[PDB]
Design an enzyme around this catalytic site. Structure first.
Site, short mmCIF file in Angstrom:
data_model
loop_
_atom_site.label_atom_id
_atom_site.label_comp_id
_atom_site.label_asym_id
_atom_site.label_seq_id
_atom_site.Cartn_x
_atom_site.Cartn_y
_atom_site.Cartn_z
N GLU A 158 0.82 -1.19 0.00
CA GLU A 158 0.00 0.00 0.00
C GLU A 158 0.87 1.26 0.00
O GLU A 158 0.81 2.07 -0.94
CB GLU A 158 -0.95 -0.03 1.20
CG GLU A 158 -1.66 1.26 1.37
CD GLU A 158 -2.48 1.63 0.15
OE1 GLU A 158 -3.71 1.42 0.15
OE2 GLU A 158 -1.88 2.10 -0.85
N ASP B 255 -9.83 2.57 6.18
CA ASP B 255 -9.87 2.20 4.75
C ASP B 255 -10.89 3.04 3.99
O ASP B 255 -10.60 3.56 2.91
CB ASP B 255 -10.20 0.72 4.60
CG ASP B 255 -8.97 -0.15 4.50
OD1 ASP B 255 -7.98 0.12 5.21
OD2 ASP B 255 -9.00 -1.14 3.72
#
Lengths: 379, 379, 379, 379
Positions: free
Chosen positions: A69, A261
């Site tokens: 990520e 998220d």
């Protein structure tokens, strides 16, 4: 005019901060000062660390690991900000320690490694793969392929081919479901994560992937835009962190609510709208999210259910949350859109142990709101 | 590889300073601090002055006037460094006070004005027009046309049409001789100024001018490249400030020697080589220029005959001279090319009353040597 | 005009470097300085060593052996550059130590010997034989036959007769397959090596071999031109080192990819086009190869598959590769052709232990690009 | 086989470019992009201009007039390339402004008009009439007659009747001399222009004119073929622009040398040979013309005497010359024929003020060499 036209078609980008009345000079200084604090600074706010003479990594300061990520985010920031040296260092670390050559997930990147490079996992995170792919295509377009593993466009197309075709003639699973054309949470699971849905990225894959896959990517773009209608709550606009294919929250393991998220959904809608201006519903959804957070102090942000009920637990990354709500103003208008941006403008980059996720989202927002998060076209 | 390939064809640019071993971070910081000093700082080094809500001008600090050379330069710097607000302020002032609507030179820009806007002249300087035209075409490509007078591409094509066609149906003269395809010193004079010859600009006019003129511009590109073989001295590489069409120096008024105007020739050869890599002779010529100056101390630069004999008179703009010799390294390689660049790197921007011409050339060299003086394509 | 006409028919040769704008004087000095470094120099770049008063050899510096490839290359360089003394020394060593008088390959030359002359092999390399034959015919034409073994034209015709007829009344194999008229990799194998295909040489054998074989040689010329259509990849233009008669790569032993041997294909197409201008496809193929290498740094050249995928392994002879791509510009036009030549012009001859193959290709390219690799006609 | 058989008899046409090894796809792409540039592009290369809702004209870019030569050419190009809309627009303008209804030349077309339609002359040019007639017969066969003035076959037969019979019952003169069957330079002059002689057209008039005139047209075909033996120089193959009936040059006004008009002779011989293969001498003549030019550089083409002596004056239309020499390869074979074609293939369409005549000849050659300049039979 550019509010209603996709930057893809025009090649021109809104500098929303300047539109809103912040000084062009001050905008440029804020961006450059932010870059330096994150990539050339010190223990205060840094998220990037060079290692050796040809490598470097993005450190999850809170979990003390290196994740795909953050690595893929770092590459996207580096290509948008035109620093190939940082880009190549991150990509080099990624290929040497994270690229998987065996097991069910061969061809994918292990999502979590230690800063020494030792594997902490043997599975990928699809949000990193799709950022890797677009960053590499942008790097190929801005700077030109070099020799492997810096043959950027080839690495991107090969990665994207794996993402669709893995498991066809082997024992693994692709990252997109072939029936509903939706990205999955992980290859081996039949549910999704709303913040992973980047229809604006898939529009570009539909132009630059290997030719046989471009039809799929174009349908993935439309499928993901429609899917977000299901995942976002019809009153608050809030999406769950994890969700099933029908949009309902997946709270198997606590991920069914609005938390870290899901903050990225609002920013993604803002960026898709600016780049492609394809789905007017996005403006209504961003309107709902900004309205929800209008009556809220960042110092008191919580976990919320998607219907907006607060938990006791505070937000882990409140600066990241306010940065994504500001970036969403690319799809909004009116006083609440300007207020979200003014809060962000008056918010410094985060320091301390939990700063990594906040500061990534912060720089993305600043790039997007200054007209510097662009589609880099082939030369 | 990029040393041998024109950046026009590849879209890829050398960052010579990085190639030579100056640090990428330091390079970017030098460009940014130079911009600030020239366009955002104080009367120590500033060359740009905003005026009112929507205007601004480049001031010749020595002659206390606004020249089309400096305005067109500031427009090119602004579009290369992506500051449309500065560009538009400069262009607005130019249109408002410099654009001539009457007399023999209607359609051209008066080359010299007072800082309040009063005309000091009623004739143009062709080097300003060609920079105006290319900077406006770059502005049209980078940012998109707005409304008059900021309809950049239209202003550029109409200006280039005047430069070629004036004097067909009326009084006045074009800025290019139609028989030899060479740019003139002024429309009404049948001689030239070697530093005005920008074949790399005319290659681009050959793609983006009004279609009927594109054949001429392509011929102008080849004619200017060959003309410089005549104008540069075969031993020293030095060109005169003014010259006849056969290349011999025009010393009617003292401009037949190597002085301020002529410094730009080496810079132009470096940029043409980097953009198009079209004439290998250019690297031989830059080789001779750098050899001539390699042993000379900048604090003792003089006016020279083109054969290299010194006058007692010192160079008015020694910083500009060393900056052009450094920019020429885009067409050179080896020890003297690196020495010219290291001298430039260790030379600070000029201060005091004569700084304007030095500081313009300085920023152009820093842009070119950092890979930031680019061809901005349609989109 | 000479770009479109075969030099065979006109007797006139393009000086491509001069066409491209390098100085005629500098071109001549580069050629003479290169000759001296390779044939009259020292341990730095030399590839030729005299031995005794009437012999000399070309040394594979990397394998420290004497090879018929290098010996035949040396004879071709010596006859093109008009040094009969070097030619005769090489040819004398060749006949005394390499010519085979017994075994299955009698009449051929052992491809590999030690510098002392002891045999390292008892089989030939057909690419050496065809260079021996043409060099000897050129030597016969430029200088005239002398007494055996310097009866050049007789040695050449006798060699060419063996190449076609061996095995007719004995236990051996010819070097050309009699059915498809293609040269083989070795007499005893039914596959080939694309870089051995010299249709421009066979056109000349069809004029100067023993009369009965001239029809075969004419058919070999057209067969080899057509064959290269099969061997060169349709996108990249790259040929494999070894291939079957249908053009598909022979990767029995690792020779199925683009590596040292195959570099010569591009140079051969350039020379055939200049000499005979017979197959316009050659210009398209050279266009593809130069496009492939346009975005590539010589310092990072690799082994590639013919479809262009890079291996980790670097090119052993990157100077040889860039020299052949430059020589190919005889069949190309446009900026990439000029860029390949400018890279070569700015590349010094190789030094160190691996210099032999690079430096042979380098001199061939310089001879061809200066208009000095010619067809020497009978007097 | 088709090299020796007239396409009239077989209905089959050589695609010479494909025979020579240019790719079929590339050939078609070159024809299509050439059509676009000349008939659909911009002021860079365009020769055709639409006007109003039903008109259009071919502009002589050099002399700023509309000529029957160019109109008839555009009509032949349009019918060969199957664009009836362009054909009809050109023919309508011709009838509207150029067809003469009064004076000595009633029934002919004024050869020169202003772009607005005003007559600049009151006499015709026979080369226009014969192209008008054949193009209209082809239009009648390809598309079928519409109504006046688009009753193509009727317009063609009536025009051809005037060309032969004018001056019987009234003032004026025919365009063919009735005694020697040769086309005249103008109706009122008893000399000719070798490039006007189109025996392959007259073979077709001998089938499709009004029946009473068909015997004459067949005699004209044979007489024109034999006449060219007199007009072409026996060594060089060069014909003069104007000539007497015995073939000797008419240099009364400077037209007795090899210049613009005469370039078409080689093209006409190539097309006659391909269509009818009737006179083997045509191959010898094209052989001599190509030999004369094989060694000459286009950028240096001159006016020449028919014996080949050069003038200082350069050729006005060098691209047209090289295109006609390439089209002549339909009657040649061997190395020089392929070289003429390769030069043409590598020559771009002409740009600038003198492009009209070059670009007409260019497109005719590309049509003929691609197998697309055909006899359109009734359906």
């Amino acid at each position: 005019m550019k509010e209603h036209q996709g930057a893809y078609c025009t090649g021109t980008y809104r500098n929303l901060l300047a539109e809103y009345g912040y000084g062009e000079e001050a905008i440029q200084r804020r961006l450059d000062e932010t870059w330096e604090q994150l990539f050339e600074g010190d223990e205060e706010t840094r998220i990037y660390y060079p290692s050796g003479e040809d490598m470097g990594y993005m450190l999850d300061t809170g979990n003390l690991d290196v994740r795909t990520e953050g690595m893929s985010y770092g590459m996207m920031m580096a290509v948008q900000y035109d620093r190939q040296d940082v880009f190549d260092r991150i990509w080099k670390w990624t290929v040497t320690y994270m690229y998987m050559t065996e097991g069910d997930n061969a061809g994918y990147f292990a999502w979590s490694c230690a800063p020494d490079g030792k594997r902490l996992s043997n599975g990928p995170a699809p949000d990193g793969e799709e950022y890797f792919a677009l960053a590499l295509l942008f790097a190929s377009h801005r700077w030109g392929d070099r020799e492997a593993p810096f043959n950027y466009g080839t690495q991107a197309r090969d990665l994207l081919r794996t993402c669709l075709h893995k498991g066809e003639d082997g024992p693994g699973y692709p990252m997109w479901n072939p029936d509903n054309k939706l990205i999955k949470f992980v290859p081996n699971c039949e549910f999704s994560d709303p913040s992973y849905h980047l229809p604006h990225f898939y529009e570009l894959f539909a132009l630059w992937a290997y030719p046989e896959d471009r039809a799929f990517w174009k349908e993935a773009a439309e499928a993901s835009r429609q899917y977000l209608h299901l995942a976002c709550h019809p009153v608050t606009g809030l999406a769950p962190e994890y969700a099933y294919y029908d949009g309902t929250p997946n709270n198997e393991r606590g991920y069914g609510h609005f938390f870290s998220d899901a903050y990225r959904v609002a920013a993604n809608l803002g960026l898709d709208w600016e780049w492609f201006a394809a789905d007017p519903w996005q403006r209504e959804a961003v309107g709902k999210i900004q309205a929800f957070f209008a009556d809220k102090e960042p110092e008191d942000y919580r976990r919320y259910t998607i219907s907006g009920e607060p938990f006791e637990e505070p937000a882990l990354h409140p600066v990241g949350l306010l940065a994504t709500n500001a970036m969403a103003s690319l799809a909004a208008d009116g006083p609440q859109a300007k207020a979200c941006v003014d809060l962000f403008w008056n918010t410094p980059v985060r320091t301390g142990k939990r700063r990594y996720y906040d500061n990534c989202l912060y720089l993305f927002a600043l790039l997007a709101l200054s007209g510097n998060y662009r589609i880099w076209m082939p030369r």
